Amino acid sequence: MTRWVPTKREEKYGVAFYNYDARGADELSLQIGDTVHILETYEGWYRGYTLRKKSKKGIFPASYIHLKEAIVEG
């Protein structure tokens, strides 16, 4: 139908602070304190996967999304 944005000029991933509870494959359950890697975007509508759930993929509202400058273990 339409062409989505390939999310350019981005760092890598960010964090999602909300109480989202997806009830389908199209959506994705998001909780506060979890990190999400955005792969797609379209203004208030991005897609990706949580650092803990790489196998799973879904979309989430940017209303509560904040991109970070990557993290380091240790």
UniProtKB/Swiss-Prot annotation:
Belongs to the DOCK family. Residues 9-70 form the SH3 domain. It comes from Mus musculus (Mouse). It is found in: Cytoplasm; Membrane. Interacts with the SH3 domains of CRK and NCK2 via multiple sites. Interacts with nucleotide-free RAC1 via its DOCKER domain. Interacts with ELMO1, ELMO2 and probably ELMO3 via its SH3 domain. Interacts with RAC1. Interacts with ELMO1 and ADGRB1. Identified in a complex with AUTS2 and ELMO2. The gene is Dock1. It comes from the Eukaryota. This is Dedicator of cytokinesis protein 1. Involved in cytoskeletal rearrangements required for phagocytosis of apoptotic cells and cell motility. Along with DOCK1, mediates CRK/CRKL regulation of epithelial and endothelial cell spreading and migration on type IV collagen. Functions as a guanine nucleotide exchange factor (GEF), which activates Rac Rho small GTPases by exchanging bound GDP for free GTP. Its GEF activity may be enhanced by ELMO1. Coiled coil: none annotated. The DOCKER domain is necessary and sufficient for the GEF activity.
